[PDB]
Scaffold this active site. Structure first.
Site, PDB file in Angstrom:
ATOM      1  N   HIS A  85      -6.189 -30.897  18.089  1.00  0.00           N
ATOM      2  CA  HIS A  85      -7.433 -30.629  17.352  1.00  0.00           C
ATOM      3  C   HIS A  85      -8.145 -31.961  17.141  1.00  0.00           C
ATOM      4  O   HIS A  85      -7.718 -32.996  17.664  1.00  0.00           O
ATOM      5  CB  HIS A  85      -7.228 -29.778  16.094  1.00  0.00           C
ATOM      6  CG  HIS A  85      -6.491 -30.457  14.991  1.00  0.00           C
ATOM      7  ND1 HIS A  85      -5.116 -30.513  14.944  1.00  0.00           N
ATOM      8  CD2 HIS A  85      -6.930 -31.067  13.869  1.00  0.00           C
ATOM      9  CE1 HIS A  85      -4.738 -31.145  13.853  1.00  0.00           C
ATOM     10  NE2 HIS A  85      -5.820 -31.503  13.193  1.00  0.00           N
ATOM     11  N   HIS A  87      -9.016 -34.000  14.486  1.00  0.00           N
ATOM     12  CA  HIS A  87      -8.801 -35.012  13.462  1.00  0.00           C
ATOM     13  C   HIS A  87      -8.172 -36.273  14.052  1.00  0.00           C
ATOM     14  O   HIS A  87      -7.596 -36.273  15.146  1.00  0.00           O
ATOM     15  CB  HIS A  87      -7.924 -34.420  12.361  1.00  0.00           C
ATOM     16  CG  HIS A  87      -8.629 -33.389  11.529  1.00  0.00           C
ATOM     17  ND1 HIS A  87      -7.960 -32.410  10.833  1.00  0.00           N
ATOM     18  CD2 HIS A  87      -9.935 -33.239  11.206  1.00  0.00           C
ATOM     19  CE1 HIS A  87      -8.821 -31.650  10.185  1.00  0.00           C
ATOM     20  NE2 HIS A  87     -10.026 -32.141  10.384  1.00  0.00           N
ATOM     21  N   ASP A  89      -5.558 -37.930  13.430  1.00  0.00           N
ATOM     22  CA  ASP A  89      -4.129 -37.933  13.740  1.00  0.00           C
ATOM     23  C   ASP A  89      -3.823 -37.298  15.094  1.00  0.00           C
ATOM     24  O   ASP A  89      -2.670 -37.328  15.521  1.00  0.00           O
ATOM     25  CB  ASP A  89      -3.281 -37.328  12.609  1.00  0.00           C
ATOM     26  CG  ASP A  89      -3.674 -35.903  12.239  1.00  0.00           C
ATOM     27  OD1 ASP A  89      -4.877 -35.579  12.191  1.00  0.00           O
ATOM     28  OD2 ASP A  89      -2.759 -35.110  11.931  1.00  0.00           O
ATOM     29  N   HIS A 150      -5.164 -24.430  10.394  1.00  0.00           N
ATOM     30  CA  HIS A 150      -5.433 -25.736   9.814  1.00  0.00           C
ATOM     31  C   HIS A 150      -6.833 -26.217  10.177  1.00  0.00           C
ATOM     32  O   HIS A 150      -7.488 -26.907   9.383  1.00  0.00           O
ATOM     33  CB  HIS A 150      -4.396 -26.702  10.355  1.00  0.00           C
ATOM     34  CG  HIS A 150      -4.731 -28.121  10.098  1.00  0.00           C
ATOM     35  ND1 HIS A 150      -4.576 -28.702   8.859  1.00  0.00           N
ATOM     36  CD2 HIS A 150      -5.281 -29.059  10.895  1.00  0.00           C
ATOM     37  CE1 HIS A 150      -4.974 -29.955   8.915  1.00  0.00           C
ATOM     38  NE2 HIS A 150      -5.420 -30.187  10.131  1.00  0.00           N
ATOM     39  N   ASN A 181      -3.767 -31.262   4.295  1.00  0.00           N
ATOM     40  CA  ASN A 181      -5.200 -31.529   4.231  1.00  0.00           C
ATOM     41  C   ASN A 181      -5.942 -30.303   4.755  1.00  0.00           C
ATOM     42  O   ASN A 181      -5.943 -30.035   5.963  1.00  0.00           O
ATOM     43  CB  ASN A 181      -5.567 -32.768   5.038  1.00  0.00           C
ATOM     44  CG  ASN A 181      -6.945 -33.285   4.686  1.00  0.00           C
ATOM     45  OD1 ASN A 181      -7.825 -32.510   4.307  1.00  0.00           O
ATOM     46  ND2 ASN A 181      -7.144 -34.591   4.811  1.00  0.00           N
TER      47      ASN A 181
HETATM   48  C1  LIG Z   1      -6.534 -37.265   9.432  1.00  0.00           C
HETATM   49  C2  LIG Z   1      -6.190 -35.952   8.730  1.00  0.00           C
HETATM   50  C3  LIG Z   1      -5.232 -36.167   7.533  1.00  0.00           C
HETATM   51  C4  LIG Z   1      -5.317 -37.281   6.701  1.00  0.00           C
HETATM   52  C5  LIG Z   1      -4.416 -37.440   5.644  1.00  0.00           C
HETATM   53  C6  LIG Z   1      -3.429 -36.490   5.408  1.00  0.00           C
HETATM   54  C7  LIG Z   1      -3.344 -35.365   6.242  1.00  0.00           C
HETATM   55  C8  LIG Z   1      -2.498 -34.240   6.288  1.00  0.00           C
HETATM   56  C9  LIG Z   1      -1.313 -33.935   5.369  1.00  0.00           C
HETATM   57  C10 LIG Z   1      -0.129 -33.502   5.948  1.00  0.00           C
HETATM   58  C11 LIG Z   1       0.979 -33.234   5.162  1.00  0.00           C
HETATM   59  C12 LIG Z   1       0.910 -33.411   3.792  1.00  0.00           C
HETATM   60  C13 LIG Z   1       2.138 -33.115   2.924  1.00  0.00           C
HETATM   61  S1  LIG Z   1       2.061 -31.403   2.313  1.00  0.00           S
HETATM   62  C14 LIG Z   1       2.187 -30.279   3.735  1.00  0.00           C
HETATM   63  O1  LIG Z   1       3.112 -31.123   1.330  1.00  0.00           O
HETATM   64  O2  LIG Z   1       0.828 -31.180   1.554  1.00  0.00           O
HETATM   65  C15 LIG Z   1      -0.268 -33.860   3.222  1.00  0.00           C
HETATM   66  F1  LIG Z   1      -0.335 -34.040   1.876  1.00  0.00           F
HETATM   67  C16 LIG Z   1      -1.380 -34.133   4.004  1.00  0.00           C
HETATM   68  C17 LIG Z   1      -2.932 -33.488   7.371  1.00  0.00           C
HETATM   69  C18 LIG Z   1      -2.377 -32.157   7.833  1.00  0.00           C
HETATM   70  O3  LIG Z   1      -2.132 -31.274   6.965  1.00  0.00           O
HETATM   71  O4  LIG Z   1      -2.256 -31.926   9.059  1.00  0.00           O
HETATM   72  N1  LIG Z   1      -3.963 -34.085   7.929  1.00  0.00           N
HETATM   73  C19 LIG Z   1      -4.232 -35.220   7.287  1.00  0.00           C
HETATM   74  N2  LIG Z   1      -7.341 -35.177   8.315  1.00  0.00           N
HETATM   75  C20 LIG Z   1      -8.615 -35.555   8.206  1.00  0.00           C
HETATM   76  C21 LIG Z   1      -9.322 -34.374   7.790  1.00  0.00           C
HETATM   77  C22 LIG Z   1     -10.809 -34.235   7.484  1.00  0.00           C
HETATM   78  N3  LIG Z   1     -11.277 -35.470   6.893  1.00  0.00           N
HETATM   79  S2  LIG Z   1     -11.549 -35.504   5.209  1.00  0.00           S
HETATM   80  O5  LIG Z   1     -11.813 -36.871   4.758  1.00  0.00           O
HETATM   81  O6  LIG Z   1     -10.337 -35.166   4.454  1.00  0.00           O
HETATM   82  C23 LIG Z   1     -12.933 -34.392   4.816  1.00  0.00           C
HETATM   83  C24 LIG Z   1     -14.178 -34.872   5.560  1.00  0.00           C
HETATM   84  N4  LIG Z   1     -14.651 -33.872   6.500  1.00  0.00           N
HETATM   85  N5  LIG Z   1      -8.414 -33.404   7.680  1.00  0.00           N
HETATM   86  N6  LIG Z   1      -7.243 -33.898   8.014  1.00  0.00           N
HETATM   87 ZN   LIG Z   2      -2.582 -33.109  10.699  1.00  0.00          ZN
HETATM   88 ZN   LIG Z   3      -5.861 -32.023  11.094  1.00  0.00          ZN
END
Ligand SMILES: C[C@@H](c1cccc2c(-c3ccc(CS(C)(=O)=O)c(F)c3)c(C(=O)O)[nH]c12)n1cc(CNS(=O)(=O)CCN)nn1
Ligand SMILES: [Zn+2]
Ligand SMILES: [Zn+2]
Length: 232
Positions: A85, A87, A89, A150, A181
């Site tokens: 996807h 993002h 990561d 997601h 997230n």
């Molecule tokens: C890089 C990526 C990202 C960054 C940081 C953290 C995550 C996380 C993440 C993953 C696991 C946990 C532990 S748990 C299941 O216990 O909660 C968690 F706490 C968080 C994810 C994701 O779940 O895969 N991805 C992460 N990311 C960026 C955006 C959109 N950007 S934005 O700034 O946020 C809004 C502006 N549009 N969405 N995801």
């Molecule tokens: Zn992720």
């Molecule tokens: Zn993501």
């Protein structure tokens, strides 16, 4: 020393590989985002005398370190990469890959969303994945679009030779108590998309989340559970 690696064994900027099955590894790296540090996973699948990469290591320097770790531990060239996807990561590091000769791929939906967000953009579009339930072959894997979860564009990856299901960020680890997230998620559709994954890959033996520890098929039901509780 053999256990699945976590942040505490991974400083930001280093990459570790973990053997999942014959010819299947996960890659693990760590990155800082909004003042907190998170691990993330990707996949490496042997493709004859070449390698297929699933997802970057979350950042240019991490992805350079990933290529160096692959050369050290496996010694076969990464020729293609798929981002599951849009993002960072998943696509952060695509520019590094492209300059290292790797052909980079993603669905048209991922490419559009990456471009709109200002993230790095895979070069090639993966057609045949725009409707939920769609599947296409890509080297030694099957790519599957389960529906919005997601993110609206999230793809999952199955390695049929090893019954390895890489769920990407549509699948969470068993220890999770929140849905990660969710800025770009569809919490209402996510359980239905997980149900599609469960129905399509009932023989999966290992399930790898986008972040955290692999396990078995239970990760799918657990993900549905945490997402439903989050929506509530
Ligand atoms: C890089 C990526 C990202 C960054 C940081 C953290 C995550 C996380 C993440 C993953 C696991 C946990 C532990 S748990 C299941 O216990 O909660 C968690 F706490 C968080 C994810 C994701 O779940 O895969 N991805 C992460 N990311 C960026 C955006 C959109 N950007 S934005 O700034 O946020 C809004 C502006 N549009 N969405 N995801
Ligand atoms: Zn992720
Ligand atoms: Zn993501």
């Amino acid at each position: 020393s053999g256990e699945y690696p976590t942040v505490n064994e991974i400083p930001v900027g280093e990459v570790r590989l973990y053997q999942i099955a014959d010819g299947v590894w996960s890659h693990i790296a760590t990155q800082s985002f909004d003042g907190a540090v998170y691990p993330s996973n990707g996949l490496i699948v042997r493709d004859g005398d070449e390698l297929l990469l699933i997802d970057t290591a979350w950042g240019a320097k991490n992805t350079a370190a990933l290529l160096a770790e692959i050369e050290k531990q496996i010694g076969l060239p990464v020729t293609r990469a798929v981002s599951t996807h849009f993002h960072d990561d998943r696509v952060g590091g695509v520019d590094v890959l492209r300059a290292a000769g790797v052909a980079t791929y993603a669905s048209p939906s991922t490419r559009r969303l990456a471009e709109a967000e200002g993230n790095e953009i895979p070069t090639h579009s993966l057609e045949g994945l725009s409707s939920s339930g769609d599947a296409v072959r890509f080297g030694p894997v099957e790519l599957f679009y389960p529906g919005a979860a997601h993110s609206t564009d999230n793809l999952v990856v199955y390695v049929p030779s090893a019954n390895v299901l890489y769920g990407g960020c549509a699948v969470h680890e068993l220890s999770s108590t929140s849905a990660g997230n969710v800025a770009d998620a569809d919490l209402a559709e996510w359980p239905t998309s997980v149900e599609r994954i469960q129905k399509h890959y009932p023989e999966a033996e290992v399930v790898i989340p986008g972040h955290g520890l692999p396990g078995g098929l239970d990760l799918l039901q657990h993900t549905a559970n945490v997402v439903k509780a989050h929506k509530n």
